Amino acid sequence: GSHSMRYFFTSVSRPGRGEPRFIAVGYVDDTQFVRFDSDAASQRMEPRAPWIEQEGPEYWDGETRKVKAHSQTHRVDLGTLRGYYNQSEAGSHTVQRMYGCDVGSDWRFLRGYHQYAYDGKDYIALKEDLRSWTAADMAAQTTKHKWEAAHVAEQLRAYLEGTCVEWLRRYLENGKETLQRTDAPKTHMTHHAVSDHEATLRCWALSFYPAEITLTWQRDGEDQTQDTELVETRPAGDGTFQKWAAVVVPSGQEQRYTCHVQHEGLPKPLTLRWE
Amino acid sequence: HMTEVVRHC
């Protein structure tokens, strides 16, 4: 399996209610390991996974100074974009930012990403080759020029291709207990008779990690995709995940349908019929 | 370990 460390920053303005609320959270793969909350007491970046309390104060001071930097950038940017878009300081506006880095099974750098968003829509984003930007608007061009002039791309790449994947290796190596595990799904199929004619076949997958899993139905062997339902993978709470897929079938034909489960924690895919 | 490279708009 491959791995990735990502950081998600959100900043929502509050007119008349003081400074905008800032929240930053960090993930390694699907496990959250740090957070910050401008309304919280400590005013300091907290841990959220045991293997990151391993760090001394040299580190926690840093991610606190750095996250306060992100915070006071988004603080200004909200006022900047409000002017960019000629909006009044009466509505609440939302700035988001995302960056991280992926590695292969050999933990070598694979791809990076950094990208910005205003009020739920794209704004600016590093190009996949990490050497130039894609502005989504006429306004974002002004940002693009500003950042082209400061060589920001040449420095986020340096962080993305270097420091980012090193600390990901550190993070994976420190928490090889948790981040490198592979919990396979505890699969089963339930059967709910709707009427005298149709019957619902629900195919569950509970308590697994990582969460990239694939559920599929197959009538007579070839893929069935009509009359199906597929809920979004959901967090259990204990750091595992749950997901199911249903299919509605005519009475008596239950055995024609087979659910197929694919996971990195599975040698070869599981297949389930009704019984 | 997040980046230190944050700039304005």
Partner: T-cell receptor, first 109, second 115 residues
Framework: KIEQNSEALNIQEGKTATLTCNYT??????LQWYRQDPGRGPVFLLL?????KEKRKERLKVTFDTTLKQSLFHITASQPADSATYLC??????????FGAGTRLTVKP | AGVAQSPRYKIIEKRQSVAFWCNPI?????LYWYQQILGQGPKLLIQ????????DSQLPKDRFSAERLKGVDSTLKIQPAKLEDSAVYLC?????????????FGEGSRLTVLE
């Protein structure tokens, strides 16, 4: 986290002046050098990015060592008109330009 | 064509008020107030980007206050001035930090606070 310059230098004409600027616990991506005269008012001189090394203008020779955490400023073929105090300045993200103290140069004729 | 600062020199007694006006380079979004004591280098007081505040955690709000209102010129007040406040007060305007992020300083406003 500090920013240390020199402490009161002076040289003869013709000889080239070297001013040093060391910083600790930082990471800038941009260095700048300024010249302030008695009578107030810093005036900008040179501006060097981290991936570059050595930038020259006229008689000015400035260097930026990312890993040494140090910048070196050179006036070559020094004139007595060059005598003033000289300021180092770092650019910390997002837009915090912090200044060192002065190194006062006096080029004796 | 120049960063304007008023007044050249200003004498005030202790507990008094004093206000320095500065007009930046035309079109510069970022304006800084810096304090420079006898021999030290400039230490930032407050920093604007347009009409908003970027950094003023260094600004002793006991006495100092400053705002840009229009996003253009700004004024820096001292109510009241302590005897430790005698210094040069520098105004500067810059564009985006980058290859053209140079700072543009005014002539300075020499404050002298007396017994």
């Amino acid at each position: 986290k500090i920013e240390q310059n020199s402490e009161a230098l002076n040289i003869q004409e013709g000889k080239t002046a070297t001013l040093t600027c060391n910083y600790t616990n930082y990471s800038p991506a941009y260095l700048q050098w300024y010249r302030q005269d008695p009578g107030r008012g810093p005036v900008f001189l040179l501006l060097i990015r981290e991936n570059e090394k050595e930038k020259r203008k006229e008689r000015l020779k400035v260097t930026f060592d990312t890993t040494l955490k140090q910048s070196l400023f050179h006036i070559t073929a020094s004139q007595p008109a060059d005598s003033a105090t000289y300021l180092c300045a770092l650019d910390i993200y997002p837009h915090d330009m912090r200044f060192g103290a002065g190194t006062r140069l006096t080029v004796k004729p | 064509a120049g960063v304007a600062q008023s007044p050249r020199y200003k004498i005030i007694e202790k507990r008094q008020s004093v206000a320095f006006w500065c007009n930046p380079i035309s079109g510069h979004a970022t304006l800084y107030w810096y304090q420079q004591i006898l021999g030290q280098g400039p230490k930032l007081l407050i920093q604007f980007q347009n009409n908003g505040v970027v950094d003023d955690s260094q600004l002793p709000k006991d006495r100092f206050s400053a705002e840009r209102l229009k996003g253009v010129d700004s004024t820096l007040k001292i109510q009241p001035a302590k005897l430790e406040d005698s210094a040069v007060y520098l105004c500067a305007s810059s564009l985006d930090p980058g290859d053209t992020g140079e700072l543009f300083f005014g002539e300075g406003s020499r404050l002298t606070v007396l017994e």
